[PDB]
Structures are given as structure tokens and as C-alpha cells.
């Protein structure tokens, strides 16, 4: 229905050689990125807590609001864009992203 | 407020009915189970992952780390994954606060 969210869910391992600094500045910048691309709303992030698959080593959830029927193309050629671009697909051990609409 | 994400694979078995008979009986749950607040589910429309990879994701809303333990220890819950675990191949589970 019109004003349905899609959501990106991003989830992440960062390699050992990532520094706290270096991943505090990534998720500023991915959350600055709702002022830079039109069709994104909003993003939240943060910390698993529990570590209930150790052996999958994923710490860390983005999920990424994008309004419906409309273009998302300058975020996938983004430079910060997690996983095509130059600036940080080099930060990750492990990634997965997910492209769904929530519904009840 | 704190996040119970989920993501889900089914097992290959497992038809398009029984998915829905699956989120609609664990939506249902936040009728049953105080500890809950809302539940969304999706399911991933990226051709890349839908091979071999997950497929499905699950948010559940609640007020804090010990309310989802809260939830999962209620007797619903229990009974749920008692005879719907059948239905996952795998899953991974993270609890977190969202933040911008």
C-alpha cells in the first residue's frame, strides 16, 4: 500500500583489524546518508547483546527505511554504500543484506 | 526500546502455506504474551540470497533485555517452538537498541 516502508536489513562482522573509531565514523556516516539519498527515511543501528550464534560472529544490525516505488540507484553507487563501494566494503568479515516490506 | 530481530531459513519441505500458517500463528503470540509489543514480519525479495541463504526476517518489540527473556520463557512461547521448530532449517537471533 502507498507510504509502505522497504526496509534494508544489513547484518555485520567487522574484521579484527577494524578500530572502534573507524567503526563509530561508518555508522555516522550510513545514518547521514537519510539527509543525502531521497527515498531514505531513516536508519537505526546497535549491538547484539546476547551472542546466541558465536560460530556466525555477526555483531552488529543496520536497518535501513526507504520509501516504496521509488528509485534507490544513488545509494547503490554511493561510495559509502556498505557493500559495492570503495570506501568501506573492505571493513566487513561477513555481510548479509535483506530486502523486505514488514507487514503483521 | 530494545529489538528481538530473527532471520529465518525454512526447511526446503516446507510450503508456501505452512509459512503463512507459521507467522500468523507467531503473531498471534502477542495476544497471548504480555511481555511482547509488536511484531513485523517481511519476507526478502534479493534474488542473490534466496538459493541457499536466509530468507525470512522477524522484528519483536520490547521494553527491555529482561523482557524479551520475559518471552522467551513464557509457556506460549515454549509451546511455539515446541512444534514449529520443525519448520526453520536455521536461524540467527540478535537482541540490540536500535539508535541513530
Known amino acids: 500500500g502507498p ?10 562482522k567487522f574484521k579484527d583489524e577494524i578500530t ?3 567503526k ?3 555508522f555516522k556516516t550510513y ?10 527515511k ?4 546497535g549491538k547484539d547483546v546476547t551472542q546466541k550464534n558465536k ?7 543496520m536497518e535501513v527505511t ?11 553507487i554511493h561510495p559509502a554504500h556498505v557493500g559495492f563501494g ?3 566494503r573492505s571493513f566487513w568479515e561477513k555481510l548479509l543484506i535483506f530486502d523486505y516490506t514488514p507487514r503483521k
Open 31 to 40: 545514518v547521514n546518508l537519510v539527509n543525502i539519498i531521497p527515498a531514505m
Open 24 to 26: 563509530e565514523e561508518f
Open 86 to 88: 570503495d570506501v568501506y
Open 66 to 76: 526507504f520509501e516504496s516505488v521509488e528509485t534507490i540507484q544513488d545509494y547503490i
Open 3 to 12: 507510504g509502505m516502508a522497504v526496509k534494508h536489513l544489513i547484518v555485520l
Open 20 to 22: 572502534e573509531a573507524q
Open 55 to 61: 560460530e556466525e560472529g555477526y555483531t552488529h544490525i
Open 42 to 45: 531513516d536508519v537505526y543501528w
